[PDB]
Paper text:
Here we report protein crystal structures of a piscine betanodavirus, the Grouper nervous necrosis virus (GNNV), in four different forms. The overall topological structure of the GNNV CP consists of the N-terminal arm (N-arm) (residues 34−51), the shell domain (S-domain) (residues 52−213), the linker region (residues 214−220) and the protrusion domain (P-domain) (residues 221−338). The S-domain comprises an eight-stranded anti-parallel β-sandwich with three short α-helices, which is a canonical structural feature similar to other virus CPs. The P-domain folds into an independent structure, including eight anti-parallel β-strands and a short α-helix connected with loops of various lengths.
In the delta-P-domain mutant, sixty copies of the S-domain assemble with interactions of I2, I3 and I5 symmetries into a T = 1 SVP with a diameter ~190 Å. Only residues 52−214 of each subunit are observed at a resolution of 3.1 Å. As expected, the delta-P-domain mutant comprises a canonical eight-stranded anti-parallel β-sandwich with three short α-helices similar to the S-domain of T = 3 GNNV-LP. In the T = 1 delta-P-domain mutant, there is no Ca2+ observed at corresponding calcium-binding sites as seen in the S-domain of T = 3 GNNV-LP. The T = 1 delta-P-domain mutant without Ca2+ incorporated shows that the region containing the residues that potentially coordinate Ca2+ exhibits an expanded geometry, decreasing subunit contacts along the two-, three- and five-fold axes, and a flatter dimeric contact of curvature ~155°, compared with T = 3 GNNV-LP.
Numbering used by the authors:
A (entry chain O), B (entry chain N), C (entry chain H), D (entry chain M), E (entry chain I), F (entry chain G), ...: 52 to 214
Amino acid sequence: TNDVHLSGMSRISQAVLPAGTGTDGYVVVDATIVPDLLPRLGHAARIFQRYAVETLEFEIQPMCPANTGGGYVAGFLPDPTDNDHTFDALQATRGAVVAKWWESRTVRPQYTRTLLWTSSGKEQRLTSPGRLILLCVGNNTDVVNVSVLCRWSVRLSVPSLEN
Amino acid sequence: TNDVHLSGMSRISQAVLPAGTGTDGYVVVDATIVPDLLPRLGHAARIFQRYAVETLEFEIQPMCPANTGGGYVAGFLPDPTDNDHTFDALQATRGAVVAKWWESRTVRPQYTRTLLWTSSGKEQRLTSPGRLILLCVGNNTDVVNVSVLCRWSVRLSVPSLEN
Amino acid sequence: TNDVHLSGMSRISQAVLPAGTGTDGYVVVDATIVPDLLPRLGHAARIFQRYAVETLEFEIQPMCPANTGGGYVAGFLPDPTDNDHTFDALQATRGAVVAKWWESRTVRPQYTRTLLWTSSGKEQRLTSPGRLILLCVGNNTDVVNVSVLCRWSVRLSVPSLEN
Amino acid sequence: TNDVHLSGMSRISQAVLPAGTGTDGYVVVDATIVPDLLPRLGHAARIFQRYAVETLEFEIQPMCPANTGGGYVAGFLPDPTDNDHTFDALQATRGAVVAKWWESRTVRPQYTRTLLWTSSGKEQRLTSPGRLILLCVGNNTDVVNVSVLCRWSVRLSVPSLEN
Amino acid sequence: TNDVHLSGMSRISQAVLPAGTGTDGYVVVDATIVPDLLPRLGHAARIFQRYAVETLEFEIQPMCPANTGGGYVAGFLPDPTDNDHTFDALQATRGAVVAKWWESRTVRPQYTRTLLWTSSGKEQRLTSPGRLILLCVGNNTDVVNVSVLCRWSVRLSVPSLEN
Amino acid sequence: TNDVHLSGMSRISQAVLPAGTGTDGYVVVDATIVPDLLPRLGHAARIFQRYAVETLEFEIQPMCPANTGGGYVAGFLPDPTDNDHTFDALQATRGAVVAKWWESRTVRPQYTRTLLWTSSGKEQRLTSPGRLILLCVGNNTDVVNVSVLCRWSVRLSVPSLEN
Amino acid sequence: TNDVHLSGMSRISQAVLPAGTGTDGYVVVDATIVPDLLPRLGHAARIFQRYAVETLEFEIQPMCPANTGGGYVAGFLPDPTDNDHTFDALQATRGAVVAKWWESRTVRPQYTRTLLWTSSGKEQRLTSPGRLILLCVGNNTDVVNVSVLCRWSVRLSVPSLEN
Amino acid sequence: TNDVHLSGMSRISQAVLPAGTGTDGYVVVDATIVPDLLPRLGHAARIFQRYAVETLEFEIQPMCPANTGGGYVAGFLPDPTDNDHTFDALQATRGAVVAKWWESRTVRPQYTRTLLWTSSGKEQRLTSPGRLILLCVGNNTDVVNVSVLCRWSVRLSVPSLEN
Amino acid sequence: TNDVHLSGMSRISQAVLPAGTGTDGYVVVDATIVPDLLPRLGHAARIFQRYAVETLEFEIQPMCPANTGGGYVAGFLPDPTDNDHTFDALQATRGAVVAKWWESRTVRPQYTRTLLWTSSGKEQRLTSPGRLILLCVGNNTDVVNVSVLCRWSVRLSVPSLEN
């Protein structure tokens, strides 16, 4: 077939949350998923022109001591468009997970599952499959170095070359 | 299957055309079809993120005496975008019906049949499957209290909670 | 195959018979059927050279109050050339219908079925499948605003680009 | 089927390159592909809302004499949005061909194959499948009268009338 | 069977186009296809009375030096009737070809495919299957001796003898 | 079958040829075959719009003494439009017969087999299948009262009423 | 197949034999069978180059009163070459018929059955299949207007064009 | 089988057409085909008595610069006996090709397929299968050195020895 | 099998025929095909004792402007021995090609097909399977740089070490 399947896993973001600064609803990560954000896919984005997302998961990897009065809710909402960053809105999505900050966790969302576009558009419903949000629950006793990782499997289409 | 199917019939609009105000080409109704317009699906759209239209039929239901020398043409054009509210243009669509103001009628269009978006978009041929237009033909002798109803059936897709 | 199939319904004419101006044998419509009379086929006849008539009906759709003392005969004579415009003459064609002015009605004729030509010619039995006539019967008590509609289904032949 | 299949071949543009005006990367033709450009599709686009491309080709037909020091690269890139008009951006596409100016040549691109819309819109990745670019390689000895032909096959879908 | 199949290939016309006299749109050949024009068929035309065209092709055979800044478009429009001799109108037909004057080329049109008449009629839609047009593109540097050839396959019917 | 099959045998003409007034080539009969010529069919022609011939035969019936130096040729040529009235022209038809004036003889032509119209038209190859010609051979020694009879089997197709 | 089958029936000759001028052995017709002599075949003779005779018959059609003391012998000898025009030599051939001058008659000969040539040769055994002779038997009382007719079926070969 | 098959390809002729001497209808080659003319068949002809052509093609091989405004029409007429050396006559034969003088070309005719004789006789349609003709179309600007080659496949039949 | 198969394509010769020196007969190449002329095979011959030629072809590859009045004949005689270097003699062999000097061409002969010998012979009918000849036809107008290439495939025989 003409379609090219790429897979990888990349750090979407890394936030450092100081000793006492989290509270119910504080947005610690808000990452809109674009090929530029996943470095290996960022390169293959310049070779093809449309990409379609075949599997997406986000691994929340917070790094703090086991004595942290932590808490987060992590979710992937499928519109890059909207800013509805509240707990209930995250928990309404499929992947949604909640955990104490000393607990790793994986969000397995359900998404567009459709053909997209490797470069910006007038209508951005076809340039990004969604965005990953990470919210505080309660308030952290200790310093947290959260890094979220996106594992991705993508099928790429129409050859091209954007310089 | 994940896709949730949902059906109903809703009053899209209700106009009161006064007692002589018609003439050929007068727009009494011009409703752009979106989840908020159909109050049951209104709520199903706050839950889910996308939706595809499985059936659409519009039931023109004017209410006036049998002694009304009226005339309407009713038609569903599938560009939620296109201002083109003229007899010929409406009659070119599929479901298009024409009738005296004391005759009920149903339009059965053909349409997008595609997958849309419960939330408003920057590009709006992904938000609405089109619009329903009721046009005067000749002039009414009498008052008409027109109510268009939409019978609909719809498959809603990715879970969410878009306030 | 090569052939294109188009289908639509279109207003062929509109007349506004006022107060008391019809009368046993008065001609309110006399429409020689060509692609130009059907807006959609007007455009698709510029593109193709020839066309064959696969279905043809006419839907008389007059508009008056139910207290109107009218009546019409309507029929399709299958000679674009035939000038005979009397009651018996119409009542000898197949679908021929007669009805009070407050009834809609459908004439379903039988016709050429042959392959014609989208463009004017020296012999016009190759340009038109016939002509739709609408006569008055009795003498209307009131103001009729009548529109006749042609429901067509046609197949187009050999490419071209007529100005 | 409710889908019509149409097929033609239309001149996309005509450029006349005078006796020494071309040069590595000089842009001679750059044409965003839309129904209006291809005469017969323009007339049928005025009749259906939607269209989808089944076959796309571009025949480059330069007219000049055999003693010309020519050269060209023809490519079709499939965003009507993209400006990258450099040799290596064209060669990166599937159809890309190069030739001396006294050599006709067909480009066989790979393209959208998706369902578009026959009128302009806010996002034009839905109105057009791409653009044909024609660039000079080297400078011409002589006068070139280049005409690019686009052969096409299209399937049109939802009835309408854009007067 | 009673039907008689004849085939051949004949010179429809021969134009001599002097050193500098062609320009965009100049009609160099305009030949209405009649049995008299194909000499072998011209004879068999006097034996039968109706002829029907089973295969038609035109071979454009321009004769000039390879250093000619030439260009032509050749097309077969299926009405002997109309004088629409513009490039776009020719290219709209099926056979349509364009080429530099030092390139042979074959137009393979689509035509009436119907029964015709071996002698003149009041309505000439049935005496000739169309006409072959040859137009200049750009302007010729040199003298061109174009000869167009029609290859034909015809089935002849009803015996007869016209003296 | 909606179609009506109708058959008769009627007198096309009657010519009385005095004692010496025939001569190689003299046209005694030249009849163009149309409904009205055939009595029964002339009435059935008023009821329907088209007819297609299904069998035709012309029975030549000269009455005169056995001592007559006569001679005729009779044939059916299939245009109503051909004035070729010469022996060789007649003989080259299929039906063609030659006989002495005291022999009954039957022309069995091959002919149109196509669908005509029951009404005169602008092109007359859609109204009559041909014409029966009768010419003298030698000269007649005696009075000859020739009568020709068309035998016909015809289908009639499209209901109507010509008054 | 490449072979073309033609059939017809033509007047080979017409002799007028005055009141008393025939006698045993008088040659009234002596016709060498060439394509030029059969008018329809005369035309097709210029299109092909070799013709082969598939069926031959001659219908003797003498026209005189029933009171004629007539008599003829008619025969087809298969060499165009030889002048042996005696009764016995005619009766030796296969078709040979004898009859009173007031009797029609048909000679059904046997012939070369071989490939021939549509135009003259140094050896004429291949340009004509034979010749038809008509001789007087006894002597005619009255004037006879004999016309002999050749019915022929021929298959034609190798395309060509003789002007 | 007592038949010896022989193949070859030989030069029938070579002509040098100087600077400006060609013109429509100028005969530059008129070669009647006999075994003496094909060198190897010449020798095999002396050994046998009868030969029959099984394949027969002519390769026209003109040599001149690409900058030549020439033109030729070549064909093979199948009688050695016919002098018709006009264009129309050549184009009517099967092989007949036309071409500018800087284009090579092959005539695949249709021909005798009969059994001929290796030696001269009174009738010469038994000794040659026909003759190759080459005609000018337009005037050559330049010097052409034209060689026509004949590829042949012949079957030789009755042994002898003609010293 | 014990056999070792070896293939290549080698430049047998490079001549350079100056701008007016060529004429019908002039020998430009005359290369006798020995293992040493084919360099790759040159080395394989020192390893084995004998070799049998399995596929042989010669590609004539003259370079010159397209405005050259040239002409050649190329052919492979399968006689290393024979000094017959004349047009007819070359045309008698199988591959033999003729062509203008600005046309590439491929001779494909039929040859010895036998087992020869990689070291010189006292009978040289077992060391080289023939020789490739190139002649002039007419005279060249421009300098010609001809290079002939021998495409070869070979099977080599019996192990050895011949200095």
